[PDB]
Amino acid sequence: AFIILDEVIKVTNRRVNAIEHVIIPRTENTIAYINSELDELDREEFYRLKK
Amino acid sequence: YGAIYSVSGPVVIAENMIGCAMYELVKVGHDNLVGEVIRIDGDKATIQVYEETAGLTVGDPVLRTGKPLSVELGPGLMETIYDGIQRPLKAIKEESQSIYIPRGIDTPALDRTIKWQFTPGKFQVGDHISGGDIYGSVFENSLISSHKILLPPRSRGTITWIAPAGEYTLDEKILEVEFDGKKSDFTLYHTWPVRVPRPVTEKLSADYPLLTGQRVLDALFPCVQGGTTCIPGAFGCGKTVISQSLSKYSNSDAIIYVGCGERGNEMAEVLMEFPELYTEMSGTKEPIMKRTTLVANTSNMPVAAREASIYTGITLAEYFRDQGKNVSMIADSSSRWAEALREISGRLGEMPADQGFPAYLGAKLASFYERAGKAVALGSPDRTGSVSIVAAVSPAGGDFSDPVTTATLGITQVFWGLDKKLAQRKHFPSINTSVSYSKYTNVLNKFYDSNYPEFPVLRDRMKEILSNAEELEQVVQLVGKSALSDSDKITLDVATLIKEDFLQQNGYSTYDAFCPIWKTFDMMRAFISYHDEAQKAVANGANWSKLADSTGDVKHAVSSSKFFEPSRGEKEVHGEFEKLLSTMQERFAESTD
Amino acid sequence: YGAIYSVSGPVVIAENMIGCAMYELVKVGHDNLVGEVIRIDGDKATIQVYEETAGLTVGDPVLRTGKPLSVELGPGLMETIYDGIQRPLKAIKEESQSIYIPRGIDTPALDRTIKWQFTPGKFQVGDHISGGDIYGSVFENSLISSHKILLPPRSRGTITWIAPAGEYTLDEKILEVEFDGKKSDFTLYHTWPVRVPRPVTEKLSADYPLLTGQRVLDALFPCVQGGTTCIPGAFGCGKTVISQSLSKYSNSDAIIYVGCGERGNEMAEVLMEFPELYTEMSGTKEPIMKRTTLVANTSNMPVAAREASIYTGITLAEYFRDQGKNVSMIADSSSRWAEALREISGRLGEMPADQGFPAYLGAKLASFYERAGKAVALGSPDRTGSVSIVAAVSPAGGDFSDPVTTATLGITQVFWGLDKKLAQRKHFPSINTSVSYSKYTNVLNKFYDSNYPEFPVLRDRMKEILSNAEELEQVVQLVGKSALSDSDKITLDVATLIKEDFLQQNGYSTYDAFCPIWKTFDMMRAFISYHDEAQKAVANGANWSKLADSTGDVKHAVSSSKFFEPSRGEKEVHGEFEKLLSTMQERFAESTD
Amino acid sequence: NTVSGVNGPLVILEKVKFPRYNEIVNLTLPDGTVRQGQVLEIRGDRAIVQVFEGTSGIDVKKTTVEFTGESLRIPVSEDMLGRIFDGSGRPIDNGPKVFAEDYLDINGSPINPYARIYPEEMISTGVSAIDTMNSIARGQKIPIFSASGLPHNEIAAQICRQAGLVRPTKDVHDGHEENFSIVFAAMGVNLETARFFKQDFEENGSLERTSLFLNLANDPTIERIITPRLALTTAEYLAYQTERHVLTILTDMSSYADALREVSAAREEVPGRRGYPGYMYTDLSTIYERAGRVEGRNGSITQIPILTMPNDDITHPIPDLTGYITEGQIFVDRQLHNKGIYPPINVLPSLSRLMKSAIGEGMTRKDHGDVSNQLYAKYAIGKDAAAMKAVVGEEALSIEDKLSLEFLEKFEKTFITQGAYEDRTVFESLDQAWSLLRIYPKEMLNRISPKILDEFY
Amino acid sequence: LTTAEYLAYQTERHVLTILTDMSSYADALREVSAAREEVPGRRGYPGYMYTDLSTIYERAGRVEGRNGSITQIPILTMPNDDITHPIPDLTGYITEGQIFVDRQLHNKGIYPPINVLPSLSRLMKSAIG
Amino acid sequence: LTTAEYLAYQTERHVLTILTDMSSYADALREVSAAREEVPGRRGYPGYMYTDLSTIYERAGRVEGRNGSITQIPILTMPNDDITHPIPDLTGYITEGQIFVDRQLHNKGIYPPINVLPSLSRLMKSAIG
Amino acid sequence: VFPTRMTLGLMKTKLKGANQGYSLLKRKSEALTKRFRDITKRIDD
């Protein structure tokens, strides 16, 4: 039981580190990139209308 | 003067303008709503009218006040609550019998039935006079003469008329200056444009040493006067609590509180609580209120008054800076000031820019901070005064990526974090060395190093101990405590002390309420002293467990210093610390052996 | 004449115009600034004046040239550096005593001080002639005629007189052509408008390789003469490096280098660099430069020049393409050309399309890439020519989804991606198979197979090694390399070697920068033989670590192979690569057992 | 005639059509103030002007004009060295009166005799972090890309005080042959920041060899845009006449861009993407063209502009346009600062286009460039491998990888860490690099030829 | 809101004002403008959306004499479950806390389904006695 | 299209018109309205872009005589790659389903690379028997 | 490259998936290492 416990904890430890460092910041950066383009399409339109 | 041609939405357009300038304050119609001239096309002027125009018509008169949007800085400024364009709230509460000021009702910018006793300064008939020179003073405090009457800037000449000592009305004159004929008469109150910064002899790097009486600012990353500081808010993280603390505990001459466009429930608290509260440097006569001049706009108040707010407060502080007093400027919050700008642009059809937020934003936020600072005071005596700016910022889009928070962090050299967690745990403020920096720090500590404190050495060593500890906590989580030595465990203990003694406060005693420079100094001296000996002794054959059982009485004593008087050794240098050095040395002989 | 009505910015309005196209060339003032009539509003034509302006009086004459903006096509343009508005920069250095053009100036577009050598043609007296016929030639190069002089398109007739062999001037007339009376007399140079593509008899499918000289380009996805290429930037592109390569290595007869409003340092690097390097077939008269004609513009140099640059360059290319010369046209960078359209659209006040970039960007861009390609030469003689358009682009949005990049991606035939991480490690130019394509590869690979190379099989195996590497690389980072097997462990390793060795072509040698079609083949062959042998060896019983250890020295030798010159063995097919095959085979026996 | 209206910083004048483009006019205010302005637009019996002084307080028939009849030019002189100016060329600390020996108009194109022969000599500040990875040639432009929460000001300061000590050493090597002068233009910065720069020039003894132009943010937005240009016109004059290498430090670029943006959303032009100007590119381009060797070929203008991202991204319209025009960038990172590394300049995506050109062999080694290629690769892979170490542990971390982990630490704490008075030289940087690089096997070190490798491990 | 201010001031009564739906009021405000020279801000919602919210908000608080009061609970419906939607964000800054009601609990079949997980009253202590 | 309608109607033929490239067609529409009084909507695309697509699309369907038909295959390349871009988004609505080609299959080395996961035709079952 | 027009909604849920996983998986990890330690002392004896 010990030897197995020793192997499984090593895998569970890698997964926490992976989701924390890689996954979450990728979701932040991608969201942001798209946000910045997106708001500008709505704004420029209003300026076009006004002109 | 003018005649109204059209009124479209909140905006009034008026013809027969042959002499309206584009900053002028005007009273529109017969309802005398407040308005200011944004643009001029031809003989037609564009005015944004900030106060409700339901009842207003076309063909009605437009009467200029004859000057831009300005604030009057006169005497009687203390123990009054104002708006950001400045009109006494208090006088409206009595007269109108309504707390807030409703449409079409206006009052002079200060009370005018009030009379003051004017004493002369150092001038006499026929002597030459210049800007910033003290022509007389008025008391308002029984601590200081808050209103020094200075000669107006943009005014100089030879004085044809000096009134003597005696009591005069605000309307009544006391000075005439001859400078290309009669320049004008002058009165106690002088006028000053909000967006125009006062002239000064010269501004200097922010370095003037004074406390805010909150230890953690000073200890972790030296608190600065003439500084610029941003603090993150979220309107229930305890920012409002530290603002009332920051205002009381300080030893500065005045505090100017600016509620830029706030809840109004927070503004209600500052009105009432501050006269209840008592000075930490002595004085009666409504203590905190007497030292404080209060500008209060809630979020519902005209977009102009909120917009003016930050400018108007900083103007009162700069003027006093010129007087040679140290003033603290506390603003909550520049995110509400920014928002208001968005409102005005949108109402005009003036294009905003990035994130829907004005293009006007960057340059304006920057214009404001540069007014704040250390200066040598305008006029011939030459004095030092300072204005310290603390501005709260908060999300403006529900993100911290908002143009405002990110623009201000660039301009500022001080950043101090603020947390929900530490506030629930009863540490107020909430500054940690991971969410802060101060680049002003090198000059401040240096200044402190001169006076008696060993400050620079101590402070670098303090930052490092809290940093190194964080890393040592991560090991406790993963591996546990079976891979940490006596020396690493010791780092943790010292760090807990630094945090306990400085960061955690809540007004436990009238020793947390005010702390001098000396008590801050003695606390850290004690922690480093223990750190070096303790680690040395474990290297020489001792254990953390051993150190702990013997240290006992001396170690609890340094933790509790914050409840006790600092006045034990002398009068502000603490005896509980001075004796500790000897006991800690003695402690270490026993520990090694 | 005209009268200048308004000068508002670089856009100038003048009344009392007449004629006026929509590309008509005008000179504004007595200063003679470059402009073009964009619009007409009423009698008044709106001209954007693209030259610098700080001293143009309103109410001066505006002179029409009577004709659209054109370039002169004739002898002596080769080995000459011009801007896009056609003024000899070299002449500008002498006259002006300034390297760049000063504003308020204008001068003729071709030097009129020199004489050129006319040699007869293939059209004698009474032969019928029709545009693009080779009337004669002028030698400009010391191995070829770079300028074969054609009769201009839409001219035809029978030649009464051909002047005899001899030297003449280029101002001097040497031909009379009869069509409908005396049609006109002709000179060596003729004009052609840049907004009119020069006609062609017929277009031919591309089939003849563009030898790019670079391994990473030949190997991953080859280009063809008659091709179209898009390259996206982010300032890690190494555009000057690859452009400099294209000029020297590409086996085209002529190369037209176009500076589209660049750094001004980089255009200066490629001018200076050509005479120092040597031609690929011998000849000196400033070697590489002798085949190279430059359009050079700088960023805040006249915008008309910048805008005209791709058009003027491509018209230069088309002329040589009708002469039956193969041409490599390098446009660097078209995104600054597109930027100009953003600017134009702004100045005028017209509404834009997506992200402020106009809609007319896609259609204009599409015409441009369509004027390039492989063709059968215009005129009776019949020759084959080519234009290969290679164009760099860049974001300004910090993504690859922005209009400029997108509109080019739509149209382009060959795409060479840019991977920021590889470039951060340095691997100029940097690509993966997933970010790049050439639709032309199939037809190219059959052609390469005839030549000697094992090229088809190597193209499929190259894609496959990179594609597998990408999938496995995600699994390694997140999960661990524990799931992976030893063959897939190898996949990462062989692929890594290809990254470092191919992509990197910056070098400090011309052997580490020029990799011939044969040198590129041997390298790729050697590396695949390794991978196949390697997957087998671990399969019948060997480790990734054990295998790695045995090849060891032999692996270093293939890495360092690239540094070694290509001029040895049979030609570039060295004995160094051939012996290496045997050593891999031997190594395979050891590795397995 | 007189003023019809003002819409923002645009002033609508009614006046006749006779003035020239950028002709100065003067506005007579009834307040006892004169304000200068320059024609942005000329139209049929009206003009639209941006005033350098003020931005508001402009009347109708109380306000009158007289046209100067003279277009906007800078009196550029060469005896302008040691004199202190503001953002218009008035003295604020009582530096010497401007005079005149030549007048040049500002248009980004004075006489423009910029480069058609590229730079090739080397300039070193003694900073390895900068010099090795980014080889600064004598007329290249490489900006400093930083972000909020960094001491970009401090690094700009490192350059300025350490330059003018390193340069005579470089004079002997034939890296230089001539004196150095610094032309500092500050835009839109705090009093406190402005004094810091002035403090640095005093402190060194290069207050007499520097020109300082100070523009503050509370001075008009129109004054702020003229400030970099004014500095640049002067700079070209010093280069021309007295043949010195002029380094221009133009700080801060974001402040300048905020000014352009207010004069483009208050213009009758619609601005580009993210409310940032459509000719924002152009405005930036004007500075950038003014780079390279100047006639007589021994003076030059070299440029380091300072950018702080106000939104922490290279996504933003300012970094992306800036980086395209210039030839590289020198990148500073947040992580390194937090840790205690000064200068905190990271080397992960910092890049020099004209690296090859800049290195030589008559004042630098030829191995500067070869060794650079290794450092960039190795560091880059090493940074990425470290993040990977965190995730995987030791179950996908090799022996070789452990060596990359060691190279990374050592590079950070030695190569990048040096105090603000520490001066290096190129030869020392190479030697220290060689040592770090030494633990790697021969096989590993594969982007550098065997000839080089074998001699120096 | 006006009717309420009169009952509260003159005859001194504690009034709770229930206002539903602030999202429909906001839409109306975005909706008007179709010949005005007034331009909206983010997501098509005004730049002056603040101003309009404020307007409702100004009638809310203690009345003068203070035994009567006007107490306001506005009700805001997220149409797409986005807390970064402009309507809740501006309001949230002005308001003294917020009540969050989530879909998840309604789904288990709890009614009312107020998750008190991110809900806050910032003057929680101040109310009780 | 008009010629196809003549083929389908008068002589009862099965007509296949293959119409490439819609994207090029979309741009052309976009370049105009830059001086028309008619104003451009979302992402600078005309609002009557839908109307333009629908004129093209109209000649498609079984003709009367019910022995002829015109079947229409429009060819769209996504210029930005996403399917929420204006060019594809509007077209997918007018049509009855969609067919997705994908970059990913192409990379592995597949031909014709067709992903089927978002691909569905909602009138498929009824037609066929 | 990822879709520009209203990706926001999907991308937000990706974040919520990720977030839920850190907390839960950390609880799970915490518990396994707490047990592991108990076994360690038993096995050694």
CB atoms within 10 A of CB D408: 18
Running DSSP on this structure, what letter comes out for residue E43? G
Is the CB of residue A37 less than 8 Å away from at least one CB of chain C? yes
Of D22, D23, D357, the CB nearest to C269: D357
Chains that touch F (3 or more CB pairs under 8 A): A, C, G
Would the CB atoms of A12 and G39 count as touching at under 8 Å?
no
Assess contact for D72 and D17: CB atoms under 8 A.
no
Chains F and B touch (3+ CB pairs under 8 A): no
Would the CB atoms of F81 and G7 count as touching at under 8 Å?
no
Please tell me what resolution, in angstroms, this structure has. Answer: 6.6
Running DSSP on this structure, what letter comes out for residue C190? E
Contacts of residues D165-169 at CB distance under 8 Å and 24 or more positions apart, as own/partner, are D165/D126, D165/D204, D165/D423, D166/D124, D166/D125, D166/D126, D166/D423, D166/D425, D167/D123, D169/D425
Give the residues after which the backbone of chain G is interrupted, taking a C-to-next-N distance over 2.5 angstroms as a break.
none
Would the CB atoms of C240 and D353 count as touching at under 8 Å?
yes
Q: With CA atoms as reference, report the closest residue to B11 among B52, B49, B51.
A: B49
* Chain G: residue whose CA lies nearest to E82: G9
* Chain B: residue whose CA lies nearest to E93: B235
* Chain F: residue whose CA lies nearest to G5: F84
CA atoms of G31 and F74, how far apart (whole Å): 59
Q: Is B399 found in the same domain as B449?
A: no
| G36: closest CA of chain E, how far (Å) | 33
Catalytic residue ranges of F: 122
Of D5, D254, D255, the CB nearest to B39: D5
CA atoms of D72 and D53, how far apart (whole Å): 15
CB atoms within 10 A of CB C351: 22
Q: Which residues of F are annotated as a binding site for ATP?
A: 122
Of A41, A44, A49, the CB nearest to F39: A49
Q: Is C573 found in the same domain as C497?
A: yes
Name every chain E residue with its beta carbon within 8 A of the beta carbon of A44.
Answer: none
Is the CB of residue A18 less than 8 Å away from at least one CB of chain C? yes
Of A9, A24, A38, the CB nearest to G36: A9
Running DSSP on this structure, what letter comes out for residue D141? B
Element of type H or E holding C445: helix C441-451
Across the strands, what pairs with C161? Answer: C176
Of C186, C209, C228, which one is at a domain's C-terminal end?
C186
CA atoms of B470 and B476, how far apart (whole Å): 10
Domains of chain C: total: 4
Taken in order B131, B137, B138, B144, the sign of the CA dihedral is positive
Tokens of C520: 């590129």
CA atoms of B573 and B577, how far apart (whole Å): 9
Range of the structural domain that residue C9 is part of? 1-69
CA atoms of B361 and D311, how far apart (whole Å): 14
- Count Cβ–Cβ pairs < 8 Å, chain A vs chain G: 56
Tokens of A39: 């708001």
- What is the distance of C-alpha E23 from the center of its chain? 9
Hey, is E14 helix, strand or coil?
strand
Name every chain E residue with its beta carbon within 8 A of the beta carbon of B46.
Answer: none
Burial class (CB in 10 A: 0-12, 13-18, 19+), B277: middle
| A14: closest CA of chain C, how far (Å) | 7
Q: Is B279 found in the same domain as B334?
A: yes
Chains D and F touch (3+ CB pairs under 8 A): no
Q: Is B582 found in the same domain as B491?
A: yes
Name every chain E residue with its beta carbon within 8 A of the beta carbon of G9.
Answer: 80, 82
Q: Which residues fall within 8 angstroms of residue G10, CB to CB, at 6 or more apart?
A: none
Name every chain D residue with its beta carbon within 8 A of the beta carbon of B350.
Answer: 8, 265-266
Chains that touch C (3 or more CB pairs under 8 A): A, D, F, G
Of C186, C208, C231, which one is at a domain's C-terminal end?
C186
Q: What is the largest CA-CA distance in chain A?
A: 75
Name every chain A residue with its beta carbon within 8 A of the beta carbon of C397.
Answer: 37
Q: Is C152 found in the same domain as C44?
A: no
- Restricting to F residues 38-57, those with a Cβ less than 8 Å away from any Cβ of G are 43
* Chain D: residue whose CA lies nearest to B438: D149
Q: Is C108 found in the same domain as C171?
A: no
CA atoms of B331 and B310, how far apart (whole Å): 7
C-alpha distances in angstroms, E50 versus D125, D190, D385? 52, 32, 48
Element of type H or E holding E15: strand E14-20
Q: Is B97 found in the same domain as B208?
A: yes
Q: Is B125 found in the same domain as B62?
A: no
Would the CB atoms of A39 and B356 count as touching at under 8 Å?
yes
CB atoms within 10 A of CB B527: 20
Q: Is C409 found in the same domain as C344?
A: yes
Name every chain B residue with its beta carbon within 8 A of the beta carbon of A50.
Answer: 349, 351
The crossing angle, in degrees rounded to 10, of helices D399-410 and D367-392 is 120
Residue B387, φ and ψ in degrees, nearest 5: -135, 125
Tokens of B90: 């208090």
Running DSSP on this structure, what letter comes out for residue D100? -
Q: Which of E42, E43, E62, E122 is catalytic?
A: E122
- For the CA atoms of chain A, what is the radius of gyration? 22
Q: Is C307 found in the same domain as C254?
A: yes
Tokens of D106: 């500002």
Tokens of B208: 């003037």
**Interface mutation vs chain B, best among D2, D153, D154, D258, most B CBs within 10 Å:** D258
Q: Is B266 found in the same domain as B342?
A: yes
Q: Which residues fall within 8 angstroms of residue G31, CB to CB, at 6 or more apart?
A: none
Per-residue DSSP letters for B32-89?
TEEEEEEEEETTEEEEEE-S--TT--SS-EEEEEEEESEEEE-S--TT-EE-SS--BH
End-to-end CA distance of chain G: 58
Hey, is E112 helix, strand or coil?
coil
Hey, is B133 helix, strand or coil?
coil
Q: Which residues fall within 8 angstroms of residue B165, CB to CB, at 6 or more apart?
A: B117, B118, B119, B120
Q: Judge if the upstream peptide bond of residue C429 is cis by omega within 30 degrees of 0.
A: yes
Is the CB of residue A48 less than 8 Å away from at least one CB of chain B? no
Taken in order D5, D8, D9, D10, the sign of the CA dihedral is negative
Which residues of G have a CB under 8 Å from any CB of A? Answer: 2-5, 7-8, 11-12, 14-15, 18-19, 21-22, 25-26, 28-29, 32-33, 35-36, 39, 43
Q: With CA atoms as reference, report the closest residue to C56 among C35, C31, C27.
A: C31
Assess contact for E53 and E72: CB atoms under 8 A.
no
Name every chain G residue with its beta carbon within 8 A of the beta carbon of E82.
Answer: 8-9, 12
Of C160, C186, C212, which one is at a domain's C-terminal end?
C186
Tokens of B304: 């102009």
Q: Which residues fall within 8 angstroms of residue C356, CB to CB, at 6 or more apart?
A: A44, C342, C345, C346, D270, D271, D272, D273, D278
Contacts of residues C178-187 at CB distance under 8 Å and 24 or more positions apart, as own/partner, are C179/C155, C183/C155, C183/C157, C186/C151, C187/C74
**Interface mutation vs chain D, best among B44, B207, B351, B413, most D CBs within 10 Å:** B351
Per-residue DSSP letters for D235-294?
HHHHHHHH--EEEEEEE-HHHHHHHHHHHHHSSSSPP-GGGS-TTHHHHHHHHHTS-EEE
Taken in order C215, C218, C219, C221, the sign of the CA dihedral is positive
CA angle B570, B576, B579 (to 5 degrees): 95
Of D270, D313, D315, the CB nearest to A51: D270
Q: Is B372 found in the same domain as B253?
A: yes
Would the CB atoms of A41 and F40 count as touching at under 8 Å?
no
Q: Which residues fall within 8 angstroms of residue E31, CB to CB, at 6 or more apart?
A: none
CA atoms of C35 and C10, how far apart (whole Å): 9
